[PDB]
From a paper:
Discovered a little over a decade ago, LPMOs are metalloenzymes that utilize a copper ion to catalyze the oxidative cleavage of oligosaccharides and polysaccharides. Most significantly, McAA9F has a broad substrate specificity, with activity on both crystalline and soluble polysaccharides. The structure of McAA9F represents the first structurally determined [name] [name] from [name].
The protein crystals grew as needle clusters; a data set was collected to 1.38 Å resolution and the structure was solved by molecular replacement. A succinimide is observed in place of Asp10, which is found in a turn connecting β1 and β2. McAA9F also lacks the conserved tyrosine residue of the motif, but instead possesses a histidine residue (His20), the imidazole side chain of which occupies an equivalent position and is likely to fulfill an equivalent proposed substrate-stacking role. Interestingly, McAA9F showed activity on both crystalline cellulose and on soluble substrates while containing an extremely short L3 loop aligned to the surface level, indicating that the absence of an extended L3 is not sufficient to define a lack of activity towards soluble substrates and oligosaccharides. While L3 in McAA9F contains hydrophilic residues capable of interacting with substrates, its considerably smaller size results in the loop being set back >5.5 Å from the +2 sites observed in CvAA9A and LsAA9A.
Residue numbers in the entry: 1 to 220
Write the structure that this text describes.
Amino acid sequence: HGYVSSIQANGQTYPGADPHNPNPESPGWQAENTDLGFVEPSAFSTPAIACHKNARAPPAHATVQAGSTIKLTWNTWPESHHGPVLDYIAPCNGDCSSASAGSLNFVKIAEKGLISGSNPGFWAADELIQNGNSWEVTIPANLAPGKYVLRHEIIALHSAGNPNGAQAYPQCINLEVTGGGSATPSGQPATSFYSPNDPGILFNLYQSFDSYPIPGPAVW
Ligand SMILES: [Cu+2]
């Protein structure tokens, strides 16, 4: 349990989207993750998996040049919640202030899963804790200018050995990308990412293994 509480682009720092205090200057999507909780695998076929429960587009955006870095800080992250950290992006039409999360066509732009070991092993989520509860996302240098939605996610696997036990923590952020990129992605809705029986979703931390198959589509 946790949420993205701060968003940095050089510098400019923005507050994250606290579900108990919707804030007009935050570029984080305004969701009903009031427990700072997760979306369960049975909901991976519903719009909740895009930007979290009942998420609504915010009226602010972070501005960032293609090729530069966004640094995201979580308010906290528990050591128990081992799992991958994944980043996706979708173009957004219009000013992105009325966009439906379920209609966004995302591509994956970065991922990290198991780093080393097993039972339970050391994971991207553990690195995120060691970094200071923070993660960096590089916006692809050839991404064309425009309005986009960044979807940053941890999938916690501490109960994922049981059916419906994985816990997905998506957090969406409105971006305006600037610069000299030329390419636009051809993505798919977030309901296409994951299934309850994917090997990286139904995954037992508490045994020996030497790899982890990261779920979702290929990095763009
Ligand atoms: Cu939790």
